[PDB]
Write an enzyme that holds these catalytic residues in place. Structure first.
Site, short mmCIF file in Angstrom:
data_model
loop_
_atom_site.label_atom_id
_atom_site.label_comp_id
_atom_site.label_asym_id
_atom_site.label_seq_id
_atom_site.Cartn_x
_atom_site.Cartn_y
_atom_site.Cartn_z
N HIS A 202 0.83 -1.29 0.00
CA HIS A 202 0.00 0.00 0.00
C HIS A 202 0.87 1.35 0.00
O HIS A 202 0.57 2.41 -0.56
CB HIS A 202 -0.88 -0.05 1.25
N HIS B 137 2.35 8.83 1.28
CA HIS B 137 1.20 8.71 0.40
C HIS B 137 1.46 9.67 -0.75
O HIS B 137 1.94 10.79 -0.53
CB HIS B 137 -0.06 9.11 1.15
N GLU C 87 -2.95 13.39 1.77
CA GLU C 87 -4.19 13.02 2.41
C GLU C 87 -4.85 14.22 3.09
O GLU C 87 -6.03 14.51 2.85
CB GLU C 87 -3.94 11.89 3.42
N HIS D 281 4.41 10.66 6.66
CA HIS D 281 3.81 10.36 7.95
C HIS D 281 4.87 9.69 8.81
O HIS D 281 5.32 8.59 8.48
CB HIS D 281 2.59 9.46 7.84
N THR E 242 -5.30 6.40 8.61
CA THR E 242 -5.88 6.63 7.29
C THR E 242 -5.86 5.38 6.41
O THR E 242 -6.23 5.46 5.24
CB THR E 242 -5.17 7.77 6.56
N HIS F 285 6.28 6.51 6.42
CA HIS F 285 5.87 6.13 5.08
C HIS F 285 5.37 7.37 4.38
O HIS F 285 5.25 8.44 4.98
CB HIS F 285 4.77 5.09 5.09
#
Ligand code: N7J
Ligand code: ZN
EC number: 4.2.1.1
Length: 257
Positions: free
Chosen positions: A61, A93, A103, A116, A195, A91
């Site tokens: 992911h 996104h 996000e 994050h 999230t 990590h």
């Protein structure tokens, strides 16, 4: 299994994880004119001098860098936080295009990506117990925009070739996460959620006002990772972000005016 595709994406997660429709879900849009300046908030304490990175991992992911959280080596304290939180992992996104990928959003502005740094509260002994607590985790969120390269990110960017597909991992020692921070630690804070599944409502979110800039070559190397595992049809790991959720009965606070 849950993901970011058409049939398994964020609009589907509530079926396995009903808390997806909960009262304190993340991310949110940060309306900068509605956020209230709270002068009783404190400076963030970011103590990363003793960090111990261990390994970097494609988890299907995102990609994650994990640290040694068996001692108070890299901790977050201060701010809205009570107690000491230990850095477990970070990590990102990110998007398929520069105008999307974060996000959290700032006055509906989407950033190209969001970093994050995940911390758990030591009063709860391990991260698995922390996630069952309303104040169990503190996540430091940092926006990425595309511009000049970020020298501190290049060591991360250069190893992604070795973890292209799901479940690949690699040694990643001696990485200093201080190289990912902006100059200012001004922030917004609100109580929120993970999230990704399980979407546990255990997070004090601390979102820095100031983006870091990364280069187009750095972010293009994020976009070559794969959601799939080796020997599977290739699916680029892009747009692995949850969109903004309803704020509901919450007030976003600002450490700065
Ligand atoms: N993306 S996030 O809100 O920083 C985050 C951080 C740690 C997490 O652990 C999780 N369980 O597998 N999901 C998750 C999301
Ligand atoms: Zn995240």
């Amino acid at each position: 299994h849950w993901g970011y595709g058409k049939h398994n994406g964020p609009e589907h997660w509530h079926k396995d994880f009903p808390i997806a429709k909960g009262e304190r879900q993340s991310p949110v849009d940060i309306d900068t004119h509605t956020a209230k300046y709270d002068p009783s908030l404190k400076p963030l304490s970011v103590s990363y001098d003793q960090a111990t990175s261990l390994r970097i991992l494609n988890n299907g992911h995102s990609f994650q860098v994990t640290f040694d959280d068996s001692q108070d080596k890299a901790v977050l304290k201060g701010g809205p936080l009570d107690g000491t939180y230990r850095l477990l992992q970070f990590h990102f996104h990110w998007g398929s295009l520069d105008g999307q990928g974060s996000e959290h959003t700032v006055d509906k502005k989407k950033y190209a990506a969001e970093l994050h740094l995940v911390h758990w509260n030591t009063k709860y002994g391990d991260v698995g117990k922390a996630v069952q607590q309303p104040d169990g985790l503190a996540v430091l969120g940092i926006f990425l925009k595309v511009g000049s390269a970020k020298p501190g990110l290049q060591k991360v960017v250069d190893v992604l070739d070795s973890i292209k597909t799901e479940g690949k991992s690699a040694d990643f020692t001696n990485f200093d996460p201080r190289g990912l921070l902006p100059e200012s630690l001004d922030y917004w804070t609100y109580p929120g959620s993970l999230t990704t599944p399980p979407l546990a409502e255990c997070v004090t979110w601390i979102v820095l006002k100031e983006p870091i800039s990364v280069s187009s070559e750095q972010v293009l190397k994020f976009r070559k990772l794969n959601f799939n595992g080796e020997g599977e049809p290739e699916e680029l790991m892009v747009d692995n972000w949850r969109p903004a959720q309803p704020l509901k009965n919450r007030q976003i606070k600002a450490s700065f005016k």
